[PDB]
Tab-separated table of N, CA and C in Angstrom:
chain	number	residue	atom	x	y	z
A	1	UNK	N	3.652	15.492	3.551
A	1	UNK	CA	3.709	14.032	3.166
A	1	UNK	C	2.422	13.279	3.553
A	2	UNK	N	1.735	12.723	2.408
A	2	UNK	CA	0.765	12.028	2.631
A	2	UNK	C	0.691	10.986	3.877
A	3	UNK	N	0.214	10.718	4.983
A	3	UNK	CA	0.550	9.761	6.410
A	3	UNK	C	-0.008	8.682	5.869
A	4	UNK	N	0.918	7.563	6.449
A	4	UNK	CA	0.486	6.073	5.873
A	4	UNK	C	-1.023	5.616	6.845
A	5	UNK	N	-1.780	4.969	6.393
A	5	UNK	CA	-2.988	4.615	7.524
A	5	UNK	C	-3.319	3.478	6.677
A	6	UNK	N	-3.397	2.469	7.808
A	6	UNK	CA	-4.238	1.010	7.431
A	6	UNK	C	-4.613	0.140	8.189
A	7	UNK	N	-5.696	-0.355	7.976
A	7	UNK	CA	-6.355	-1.555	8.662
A	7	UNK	C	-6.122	-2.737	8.318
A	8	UNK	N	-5.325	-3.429	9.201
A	8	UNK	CA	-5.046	-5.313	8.405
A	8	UNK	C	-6.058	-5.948	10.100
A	9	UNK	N	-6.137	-7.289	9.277
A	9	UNK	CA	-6.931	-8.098	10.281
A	9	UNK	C	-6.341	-9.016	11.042
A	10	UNK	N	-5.703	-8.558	12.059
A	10	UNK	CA	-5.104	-9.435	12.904
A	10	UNK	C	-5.543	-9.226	14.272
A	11	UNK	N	-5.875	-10.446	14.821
A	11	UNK	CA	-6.443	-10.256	16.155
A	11	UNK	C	-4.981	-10.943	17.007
A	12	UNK	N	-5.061	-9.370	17.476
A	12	UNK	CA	-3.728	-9.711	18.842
A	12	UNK	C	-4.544	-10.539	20.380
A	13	UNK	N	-3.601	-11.271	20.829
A	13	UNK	CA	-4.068	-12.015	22.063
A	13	UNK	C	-3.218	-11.493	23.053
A	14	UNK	N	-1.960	-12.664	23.243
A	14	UNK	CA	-1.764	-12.327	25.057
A	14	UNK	C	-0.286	-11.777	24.042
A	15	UNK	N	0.203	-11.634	23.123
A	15	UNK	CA	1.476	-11.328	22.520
A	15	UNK	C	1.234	-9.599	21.829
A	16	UNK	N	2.456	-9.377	21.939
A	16	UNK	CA	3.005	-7.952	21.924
A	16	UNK	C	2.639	-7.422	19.792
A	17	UNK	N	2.276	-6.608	19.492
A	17	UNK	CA	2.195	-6.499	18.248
A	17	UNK	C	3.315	-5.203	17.915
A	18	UNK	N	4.538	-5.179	17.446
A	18	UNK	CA	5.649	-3.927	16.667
A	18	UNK	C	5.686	-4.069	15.512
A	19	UNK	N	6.450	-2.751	14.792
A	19	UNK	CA	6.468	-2.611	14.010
A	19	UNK	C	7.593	-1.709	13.676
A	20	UNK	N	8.182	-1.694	11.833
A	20	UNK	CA	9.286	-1.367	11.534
A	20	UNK	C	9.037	-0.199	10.313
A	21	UNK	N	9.407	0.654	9.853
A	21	UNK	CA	9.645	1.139	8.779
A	21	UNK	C	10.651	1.474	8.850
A	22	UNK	N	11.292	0.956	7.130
A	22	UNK	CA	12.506	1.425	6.779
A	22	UNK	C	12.205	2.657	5.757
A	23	UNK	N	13.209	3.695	5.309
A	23	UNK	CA	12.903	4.474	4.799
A	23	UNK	C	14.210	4.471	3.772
A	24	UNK	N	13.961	5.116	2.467
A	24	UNK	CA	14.922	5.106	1.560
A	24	UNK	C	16.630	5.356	2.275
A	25	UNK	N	16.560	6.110	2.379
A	25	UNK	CA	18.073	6.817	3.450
A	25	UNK	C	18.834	5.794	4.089
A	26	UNK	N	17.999	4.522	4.626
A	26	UNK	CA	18.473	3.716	5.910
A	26	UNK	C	18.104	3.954	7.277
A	27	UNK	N	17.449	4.959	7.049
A	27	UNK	CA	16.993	5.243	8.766
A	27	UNK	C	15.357	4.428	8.767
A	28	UNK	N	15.291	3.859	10.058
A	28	UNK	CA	14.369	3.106	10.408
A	28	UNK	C	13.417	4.035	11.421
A	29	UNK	N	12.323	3.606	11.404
A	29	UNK	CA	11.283	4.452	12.750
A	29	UNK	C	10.146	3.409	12.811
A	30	UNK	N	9.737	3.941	14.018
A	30	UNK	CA	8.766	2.882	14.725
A	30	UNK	C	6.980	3.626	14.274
A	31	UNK	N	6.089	2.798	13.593
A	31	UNK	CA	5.078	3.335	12.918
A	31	UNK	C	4.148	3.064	14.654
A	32	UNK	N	3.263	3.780	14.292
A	32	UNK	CA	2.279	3.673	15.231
A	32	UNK	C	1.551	2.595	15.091
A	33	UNK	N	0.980	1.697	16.192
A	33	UNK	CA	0.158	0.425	16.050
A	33	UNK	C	-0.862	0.817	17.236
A	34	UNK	N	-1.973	0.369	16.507
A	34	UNK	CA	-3.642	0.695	17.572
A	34	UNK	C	-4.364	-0.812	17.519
A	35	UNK	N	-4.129	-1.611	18.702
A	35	UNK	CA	-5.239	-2.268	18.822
A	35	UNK	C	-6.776	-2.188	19.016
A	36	UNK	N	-7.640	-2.244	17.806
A	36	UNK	CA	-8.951	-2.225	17.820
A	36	UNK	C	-9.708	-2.950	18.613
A	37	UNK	N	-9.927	-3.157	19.992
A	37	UNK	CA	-9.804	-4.423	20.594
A	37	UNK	C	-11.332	-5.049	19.768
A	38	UNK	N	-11.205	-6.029	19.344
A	38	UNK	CA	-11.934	-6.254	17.538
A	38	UNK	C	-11.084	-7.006	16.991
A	39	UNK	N	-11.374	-7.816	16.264
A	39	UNK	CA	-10.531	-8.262	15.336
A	39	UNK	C	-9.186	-7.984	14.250
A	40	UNK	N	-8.895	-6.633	14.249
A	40	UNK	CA	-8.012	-6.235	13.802
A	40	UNK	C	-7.033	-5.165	14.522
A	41	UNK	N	-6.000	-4.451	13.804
A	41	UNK	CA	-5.170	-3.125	13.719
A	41	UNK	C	-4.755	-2.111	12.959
A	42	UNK	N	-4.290	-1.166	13.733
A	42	UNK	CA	-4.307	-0.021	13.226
A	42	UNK	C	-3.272	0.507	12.855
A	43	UNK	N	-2.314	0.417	11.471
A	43	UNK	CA	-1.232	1.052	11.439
A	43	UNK	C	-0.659	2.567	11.103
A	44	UNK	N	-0.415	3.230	11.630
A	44	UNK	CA	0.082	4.551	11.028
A	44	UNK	C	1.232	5.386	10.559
A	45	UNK	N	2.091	5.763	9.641
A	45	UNK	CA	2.848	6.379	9.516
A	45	UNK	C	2.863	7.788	9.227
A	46	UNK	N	3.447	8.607	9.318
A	46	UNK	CA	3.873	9.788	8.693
A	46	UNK	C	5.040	10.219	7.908
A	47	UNK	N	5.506	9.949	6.958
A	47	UNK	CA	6.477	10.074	6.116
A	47	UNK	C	7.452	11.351	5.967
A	48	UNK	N	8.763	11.227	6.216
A	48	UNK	CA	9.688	12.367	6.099
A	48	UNK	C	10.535	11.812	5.089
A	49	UNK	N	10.532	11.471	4.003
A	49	UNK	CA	11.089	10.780	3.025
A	49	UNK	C	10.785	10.568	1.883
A	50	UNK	N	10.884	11.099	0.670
A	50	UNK	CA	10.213	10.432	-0.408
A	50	UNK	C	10.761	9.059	-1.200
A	51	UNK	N	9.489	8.318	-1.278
A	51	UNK	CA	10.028	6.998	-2.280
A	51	UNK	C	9.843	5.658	-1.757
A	52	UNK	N	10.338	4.793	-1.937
A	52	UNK	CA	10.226	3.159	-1.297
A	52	UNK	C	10.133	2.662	0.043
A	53	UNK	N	9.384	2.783	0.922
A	53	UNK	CA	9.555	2.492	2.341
A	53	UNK	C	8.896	0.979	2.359
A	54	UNK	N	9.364	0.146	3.428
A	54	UNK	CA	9.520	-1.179	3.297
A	54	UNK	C	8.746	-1.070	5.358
A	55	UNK	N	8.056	-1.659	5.506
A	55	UNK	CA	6.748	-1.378	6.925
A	55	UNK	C	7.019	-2.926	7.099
A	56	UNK	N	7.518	-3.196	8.290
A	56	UNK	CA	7.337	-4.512	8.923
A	56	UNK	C	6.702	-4.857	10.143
A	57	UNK	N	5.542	-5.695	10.356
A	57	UNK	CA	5.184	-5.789	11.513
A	57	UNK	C	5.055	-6.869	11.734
A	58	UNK	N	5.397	-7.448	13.785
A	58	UNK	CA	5.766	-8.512	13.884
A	58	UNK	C	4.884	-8.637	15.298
A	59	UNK	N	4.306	-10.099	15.714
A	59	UNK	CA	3.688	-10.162	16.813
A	59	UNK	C	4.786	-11.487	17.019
A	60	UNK	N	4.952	-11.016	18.465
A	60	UNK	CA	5.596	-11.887	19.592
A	60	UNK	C	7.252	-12.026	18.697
A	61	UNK	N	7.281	-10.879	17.986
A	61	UNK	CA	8.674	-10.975	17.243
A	61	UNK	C	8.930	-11.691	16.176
A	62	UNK	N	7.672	-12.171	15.178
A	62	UNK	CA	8.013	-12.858	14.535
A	62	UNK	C	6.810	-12.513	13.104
A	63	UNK	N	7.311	-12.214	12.055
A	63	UNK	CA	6.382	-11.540	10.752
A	63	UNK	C	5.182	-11.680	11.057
A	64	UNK	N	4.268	-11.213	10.923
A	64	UNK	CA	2.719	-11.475	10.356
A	64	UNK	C	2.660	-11.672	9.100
A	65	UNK	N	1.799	-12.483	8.398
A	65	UNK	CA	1.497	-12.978	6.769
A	65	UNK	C	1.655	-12.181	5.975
A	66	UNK	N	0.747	-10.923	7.072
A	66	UNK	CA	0.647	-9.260	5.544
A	66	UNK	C	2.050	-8.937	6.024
A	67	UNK	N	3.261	-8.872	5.735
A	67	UNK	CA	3.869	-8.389	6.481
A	67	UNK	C	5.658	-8.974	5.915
A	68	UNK	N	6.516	-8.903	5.299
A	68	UNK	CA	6.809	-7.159	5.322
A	68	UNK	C	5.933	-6.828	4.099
A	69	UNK	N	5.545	-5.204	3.732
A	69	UNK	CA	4.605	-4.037	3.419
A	69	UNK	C	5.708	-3.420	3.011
A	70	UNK	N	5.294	-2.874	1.007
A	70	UNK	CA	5.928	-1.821	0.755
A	70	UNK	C	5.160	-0.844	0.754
A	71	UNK	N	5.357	0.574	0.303
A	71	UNK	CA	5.072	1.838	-0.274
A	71	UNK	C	5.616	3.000	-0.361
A	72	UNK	N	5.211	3.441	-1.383
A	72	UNK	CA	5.859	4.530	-2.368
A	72	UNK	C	5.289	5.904	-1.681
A	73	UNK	N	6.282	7.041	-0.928
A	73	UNK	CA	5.376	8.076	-0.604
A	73	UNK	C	6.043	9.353	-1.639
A	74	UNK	N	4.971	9.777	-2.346
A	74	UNK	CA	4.964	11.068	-3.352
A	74	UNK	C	5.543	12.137	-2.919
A	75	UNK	N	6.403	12.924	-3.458
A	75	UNK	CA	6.840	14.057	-3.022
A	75	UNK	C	5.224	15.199	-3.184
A	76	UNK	N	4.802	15.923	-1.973
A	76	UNK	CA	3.772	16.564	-2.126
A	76	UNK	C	3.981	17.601	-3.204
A	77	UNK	N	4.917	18.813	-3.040
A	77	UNK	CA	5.048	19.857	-4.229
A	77	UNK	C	4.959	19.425	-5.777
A	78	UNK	N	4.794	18.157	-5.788
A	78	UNK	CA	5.235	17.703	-7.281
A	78	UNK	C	3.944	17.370	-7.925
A	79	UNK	N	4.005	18.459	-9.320
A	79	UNK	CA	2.874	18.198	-10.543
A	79	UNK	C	2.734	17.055	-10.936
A	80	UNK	N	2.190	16.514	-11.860
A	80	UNK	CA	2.392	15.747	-12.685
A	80	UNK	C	1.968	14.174	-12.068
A	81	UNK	N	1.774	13.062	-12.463
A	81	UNK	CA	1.221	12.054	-11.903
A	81	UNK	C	1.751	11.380	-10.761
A	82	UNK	N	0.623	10.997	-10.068
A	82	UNK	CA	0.584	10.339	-9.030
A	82	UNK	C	-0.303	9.357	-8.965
A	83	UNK	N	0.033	7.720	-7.582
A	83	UNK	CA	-0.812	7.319	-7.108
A	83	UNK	C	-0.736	6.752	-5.657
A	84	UNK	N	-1.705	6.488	-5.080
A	84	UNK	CA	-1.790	6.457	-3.035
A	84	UNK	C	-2.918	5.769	-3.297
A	85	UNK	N	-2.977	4.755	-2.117
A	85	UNK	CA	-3.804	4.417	-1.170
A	85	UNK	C	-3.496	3.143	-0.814
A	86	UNK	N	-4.507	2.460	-0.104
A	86	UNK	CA	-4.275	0.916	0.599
A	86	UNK	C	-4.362	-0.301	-0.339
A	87	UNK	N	-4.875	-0.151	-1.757
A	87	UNK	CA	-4.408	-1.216	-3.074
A	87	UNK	C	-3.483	-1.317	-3.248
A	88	UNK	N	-2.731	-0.281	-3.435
A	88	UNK	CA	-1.228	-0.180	-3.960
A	88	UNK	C	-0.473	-0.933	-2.698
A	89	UNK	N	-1.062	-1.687	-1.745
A	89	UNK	CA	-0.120	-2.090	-0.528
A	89	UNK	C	-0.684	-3.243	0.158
A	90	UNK	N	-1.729	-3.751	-0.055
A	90	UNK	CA	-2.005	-4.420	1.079
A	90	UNK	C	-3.717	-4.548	0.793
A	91	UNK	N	-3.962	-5.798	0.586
A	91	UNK	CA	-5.441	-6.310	0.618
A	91	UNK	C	-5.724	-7.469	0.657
A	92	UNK	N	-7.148	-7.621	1.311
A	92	UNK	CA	-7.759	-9.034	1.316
A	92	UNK	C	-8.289	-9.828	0.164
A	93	UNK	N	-7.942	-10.754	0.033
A	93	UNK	CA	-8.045	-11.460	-1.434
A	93	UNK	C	-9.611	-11.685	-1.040
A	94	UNK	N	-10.364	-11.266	-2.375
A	94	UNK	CA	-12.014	-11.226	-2.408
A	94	UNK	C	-12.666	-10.618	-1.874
A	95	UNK	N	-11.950	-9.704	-1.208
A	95	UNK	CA	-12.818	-8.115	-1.024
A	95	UNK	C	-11.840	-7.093	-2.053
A	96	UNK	N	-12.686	-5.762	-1.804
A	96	UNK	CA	-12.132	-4.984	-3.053
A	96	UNK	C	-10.967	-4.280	-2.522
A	97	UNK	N	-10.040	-4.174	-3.412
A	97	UNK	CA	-8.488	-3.113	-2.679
A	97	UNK	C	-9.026	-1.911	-4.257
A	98	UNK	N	-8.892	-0.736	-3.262
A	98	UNK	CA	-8.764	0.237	-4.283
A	98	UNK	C	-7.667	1.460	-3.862
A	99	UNK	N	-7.023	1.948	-5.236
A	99	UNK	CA	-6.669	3.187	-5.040
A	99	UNK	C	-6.746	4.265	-6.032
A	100	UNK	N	-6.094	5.698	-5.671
A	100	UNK	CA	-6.471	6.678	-6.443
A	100	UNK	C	-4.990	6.973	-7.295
A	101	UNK	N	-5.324	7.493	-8.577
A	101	UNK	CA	-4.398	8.868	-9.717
A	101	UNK	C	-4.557	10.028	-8.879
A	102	UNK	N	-4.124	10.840	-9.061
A	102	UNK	CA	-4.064	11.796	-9.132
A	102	UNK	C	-3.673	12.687	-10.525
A	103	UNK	N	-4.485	13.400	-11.491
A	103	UNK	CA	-4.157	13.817	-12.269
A	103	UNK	C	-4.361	15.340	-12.805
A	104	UNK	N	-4.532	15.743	-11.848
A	104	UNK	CA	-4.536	17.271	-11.921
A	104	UNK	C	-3.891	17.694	-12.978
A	105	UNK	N	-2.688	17.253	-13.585
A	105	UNK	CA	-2.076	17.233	-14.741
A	105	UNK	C	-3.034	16.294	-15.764
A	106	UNK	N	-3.603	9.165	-21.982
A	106	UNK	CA	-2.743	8.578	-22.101
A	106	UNK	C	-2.300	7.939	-20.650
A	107	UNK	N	-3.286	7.169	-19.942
A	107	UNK	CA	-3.021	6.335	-18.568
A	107	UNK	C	-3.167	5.040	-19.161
A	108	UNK	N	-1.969	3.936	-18.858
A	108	UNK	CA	-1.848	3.107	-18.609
A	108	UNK	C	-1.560	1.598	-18.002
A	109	UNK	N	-2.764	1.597	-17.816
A	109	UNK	CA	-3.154	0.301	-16.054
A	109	UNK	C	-2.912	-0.996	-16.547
A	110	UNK	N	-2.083	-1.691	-15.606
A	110	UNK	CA	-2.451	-3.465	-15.492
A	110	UNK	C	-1.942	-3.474	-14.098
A	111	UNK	N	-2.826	-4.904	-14.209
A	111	UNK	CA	-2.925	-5.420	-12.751
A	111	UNK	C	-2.701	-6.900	-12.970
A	112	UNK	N	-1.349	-7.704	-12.295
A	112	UNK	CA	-1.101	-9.171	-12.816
A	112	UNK	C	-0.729	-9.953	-11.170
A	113	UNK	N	-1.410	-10.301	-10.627
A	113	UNK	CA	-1.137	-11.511	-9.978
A	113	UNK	C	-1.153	-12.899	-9.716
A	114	UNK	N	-1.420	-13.384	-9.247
A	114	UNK	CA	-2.501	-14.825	-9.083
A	114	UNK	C	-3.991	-15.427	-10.013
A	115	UNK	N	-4.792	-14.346	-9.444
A	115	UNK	CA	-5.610	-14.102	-10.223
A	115	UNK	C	-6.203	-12.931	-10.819
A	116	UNK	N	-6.732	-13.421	-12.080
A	116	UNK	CA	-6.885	-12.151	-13.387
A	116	UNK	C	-7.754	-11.383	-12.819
A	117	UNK	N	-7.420	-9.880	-12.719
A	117	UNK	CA	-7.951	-8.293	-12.082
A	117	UNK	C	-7.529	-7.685	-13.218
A	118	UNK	N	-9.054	-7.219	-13.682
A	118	UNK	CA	-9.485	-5.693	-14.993
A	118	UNK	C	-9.990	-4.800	-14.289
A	119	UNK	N	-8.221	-3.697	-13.906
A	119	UNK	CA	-8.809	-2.637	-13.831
A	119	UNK	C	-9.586	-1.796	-14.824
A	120	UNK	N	-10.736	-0.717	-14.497
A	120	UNK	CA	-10.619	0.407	-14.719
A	120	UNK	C	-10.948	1.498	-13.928
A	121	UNK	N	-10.279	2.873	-14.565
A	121	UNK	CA	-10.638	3.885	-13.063
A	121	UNK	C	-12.303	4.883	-13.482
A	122	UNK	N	-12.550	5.186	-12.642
A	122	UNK	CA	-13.584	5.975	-13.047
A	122	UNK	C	-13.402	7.633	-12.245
A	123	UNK	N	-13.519	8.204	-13.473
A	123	UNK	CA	-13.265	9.641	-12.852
A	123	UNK	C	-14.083	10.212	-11.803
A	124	UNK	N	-13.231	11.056	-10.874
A	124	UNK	CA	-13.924	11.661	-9.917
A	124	UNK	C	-14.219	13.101	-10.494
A	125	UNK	N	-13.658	13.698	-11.455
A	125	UNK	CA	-14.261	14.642	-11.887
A	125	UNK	C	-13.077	15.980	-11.127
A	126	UNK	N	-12.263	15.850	-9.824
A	126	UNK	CA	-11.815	16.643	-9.149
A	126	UNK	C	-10.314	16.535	-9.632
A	127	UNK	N	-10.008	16.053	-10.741
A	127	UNK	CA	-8.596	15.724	-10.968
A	127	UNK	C	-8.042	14.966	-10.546
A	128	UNK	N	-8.783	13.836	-10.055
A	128	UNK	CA	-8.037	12.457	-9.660
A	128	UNK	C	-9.396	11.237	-9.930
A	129	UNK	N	-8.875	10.231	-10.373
A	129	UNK	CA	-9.901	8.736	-10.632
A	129	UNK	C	-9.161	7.712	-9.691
A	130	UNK	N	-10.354	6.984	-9.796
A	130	UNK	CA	-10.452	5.829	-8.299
A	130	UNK	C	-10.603	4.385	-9.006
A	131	UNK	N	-8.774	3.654	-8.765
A	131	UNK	CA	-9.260	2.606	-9.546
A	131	UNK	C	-9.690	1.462	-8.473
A	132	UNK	N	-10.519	0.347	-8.741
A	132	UNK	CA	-10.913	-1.047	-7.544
A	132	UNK	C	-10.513	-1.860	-8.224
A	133	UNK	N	-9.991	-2.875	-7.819
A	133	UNK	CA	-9.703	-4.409	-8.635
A	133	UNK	C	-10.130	-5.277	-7.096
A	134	UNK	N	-10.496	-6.331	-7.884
A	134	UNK	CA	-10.805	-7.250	-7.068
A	134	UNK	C	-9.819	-8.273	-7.059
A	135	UNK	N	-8.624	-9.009	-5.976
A	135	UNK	CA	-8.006	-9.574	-6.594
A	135	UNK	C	-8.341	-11.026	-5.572
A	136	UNK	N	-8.915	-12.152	-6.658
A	136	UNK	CA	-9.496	-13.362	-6.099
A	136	UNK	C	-8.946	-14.238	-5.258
A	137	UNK	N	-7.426	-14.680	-5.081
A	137	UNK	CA	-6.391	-15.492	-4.815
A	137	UNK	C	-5.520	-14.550	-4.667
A	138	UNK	N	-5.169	-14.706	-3.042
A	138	UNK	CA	-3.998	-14.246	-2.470
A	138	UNK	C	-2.616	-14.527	-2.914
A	139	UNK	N	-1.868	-13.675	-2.750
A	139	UNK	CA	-0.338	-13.796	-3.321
A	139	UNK	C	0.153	-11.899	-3.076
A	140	UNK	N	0.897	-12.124	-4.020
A	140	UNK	CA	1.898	-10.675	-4.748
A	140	UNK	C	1.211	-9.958	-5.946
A	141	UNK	N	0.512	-9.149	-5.622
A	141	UNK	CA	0.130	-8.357	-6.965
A	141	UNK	C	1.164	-7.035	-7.430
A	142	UNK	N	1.450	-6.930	-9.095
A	142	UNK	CA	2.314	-6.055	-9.271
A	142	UNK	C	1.123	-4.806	-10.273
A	143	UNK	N	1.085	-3.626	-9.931
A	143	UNK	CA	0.118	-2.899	-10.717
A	143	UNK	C	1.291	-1.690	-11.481
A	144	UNK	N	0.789	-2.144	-12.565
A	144	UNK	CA	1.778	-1.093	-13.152
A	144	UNK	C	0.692	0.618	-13.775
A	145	UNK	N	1.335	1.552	-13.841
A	145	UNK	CA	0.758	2.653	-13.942
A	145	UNK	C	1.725	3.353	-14.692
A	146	UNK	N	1.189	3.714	-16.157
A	146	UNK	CA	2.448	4.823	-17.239
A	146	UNK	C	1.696	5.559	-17.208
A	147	UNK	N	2.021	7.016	-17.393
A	147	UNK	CA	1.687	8.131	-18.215
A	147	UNK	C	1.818	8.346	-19.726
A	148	UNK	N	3.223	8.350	-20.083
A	148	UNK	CA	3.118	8.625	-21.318
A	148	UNK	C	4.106	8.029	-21.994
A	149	UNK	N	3.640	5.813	-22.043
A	149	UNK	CA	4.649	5.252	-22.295
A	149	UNK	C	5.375	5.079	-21.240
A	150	UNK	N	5.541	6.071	-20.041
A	150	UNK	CA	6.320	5.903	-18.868
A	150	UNK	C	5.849	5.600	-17.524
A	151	UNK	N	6.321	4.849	-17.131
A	151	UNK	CA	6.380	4.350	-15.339
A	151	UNK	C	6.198	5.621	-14.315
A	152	UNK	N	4.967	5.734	-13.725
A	152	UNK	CA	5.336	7.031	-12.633
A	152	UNK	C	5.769	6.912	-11.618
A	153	UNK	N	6.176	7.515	-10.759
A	153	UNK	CA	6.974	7.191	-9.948
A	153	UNK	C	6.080	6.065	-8.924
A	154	UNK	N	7.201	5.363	-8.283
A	154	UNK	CA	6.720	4.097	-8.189
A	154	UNK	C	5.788	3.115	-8.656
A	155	UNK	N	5.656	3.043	-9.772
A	155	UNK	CA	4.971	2.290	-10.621
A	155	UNK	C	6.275	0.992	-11.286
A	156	UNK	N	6.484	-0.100	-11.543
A	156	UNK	CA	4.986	-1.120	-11.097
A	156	UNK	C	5.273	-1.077	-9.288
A	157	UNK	N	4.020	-1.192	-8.650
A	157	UNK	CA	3.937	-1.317	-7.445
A	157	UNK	C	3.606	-2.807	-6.994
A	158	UNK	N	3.601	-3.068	-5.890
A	158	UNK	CA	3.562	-4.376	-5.664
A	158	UNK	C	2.207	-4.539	-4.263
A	159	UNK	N	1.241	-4.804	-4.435
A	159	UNK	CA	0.454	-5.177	-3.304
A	159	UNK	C	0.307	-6.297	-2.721
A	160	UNK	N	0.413	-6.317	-1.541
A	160	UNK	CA	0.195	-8.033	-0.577
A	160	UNK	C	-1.095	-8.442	-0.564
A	161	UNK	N	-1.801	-9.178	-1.134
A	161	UNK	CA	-2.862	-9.948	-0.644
A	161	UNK	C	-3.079	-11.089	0.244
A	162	UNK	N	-3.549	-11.149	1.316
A	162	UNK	CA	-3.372	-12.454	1.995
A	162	UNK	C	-5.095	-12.623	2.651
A	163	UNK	N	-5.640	-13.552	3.152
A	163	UNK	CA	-6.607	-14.116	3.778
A	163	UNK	C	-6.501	-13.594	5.186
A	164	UNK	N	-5.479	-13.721	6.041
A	164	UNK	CA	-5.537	-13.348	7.438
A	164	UNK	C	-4.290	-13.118	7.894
């Protein structure tokens, strides 16, 4: 299972920073958190589950902005399309969020939030392309991804954009 990893920008002070993942099933687990002592953190998961996991993290017990966090984790043995990374979940409005296809195995991208983001991907040549959108104004972005006419798994996805 692909391990969740991300950097959001929150500078912890004299308060406690936790965190939640829920996992399809109902079972909950505690993700790893790394203070960078720096301006930000470090979140990590490792996934025993395939599909919708819902990541909450809270300082002094109470949400952070980015926060609750979905994502979709891929069953590894499985052909056929895929997509991962930190776009599909979580970015700073006016810097770039990108993520990857996987197509080792007719792609069709949009990207609709707040403000107007034209993806396109550019091939890596290794059986997977790398798409970037820039998305200007923070909010809820939903990115949808078909193969053939169809939704891949977890597609449309939903990414958080926020400022801080």
């Amino acid at each position: 299972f692909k391990p969740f990893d991300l950097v959001i920008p929150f500078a912890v002070r004299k308060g406690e920073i936790t965190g939640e993942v829920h996992m399809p099933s109902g079972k909950t687990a505690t993700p790893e958190i790394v203070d960078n002592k720096d301006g930000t953190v470090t979140v990590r998961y490792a996934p025993t589950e395939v599909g919708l996991h819902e990541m909450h993290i809270k300082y002094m017990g109470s949400h952070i902005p980015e926060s609750p966090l979905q994502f979709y984790v891929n069953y590894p043995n499985s052909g056929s399309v895929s997509a991962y990374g930190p776009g599909l979940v979580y970015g700073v409005a006016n810097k770039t969020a990108t993520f990857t296809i996987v197509t080792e195995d007719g792609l069709d991208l949009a990207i609709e939030g707040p403000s107007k983001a034209e993806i396109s991907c550019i091939d890596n040549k290794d059986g997977t392309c790398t798409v970037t959108y820039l998305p200007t104004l923070p909010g809820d972005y939903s990115i949808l991804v078909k193969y053939n006419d169809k939704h891949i798994p977890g597609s449309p996805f939903t990414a958080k954009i926020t400022d801080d």
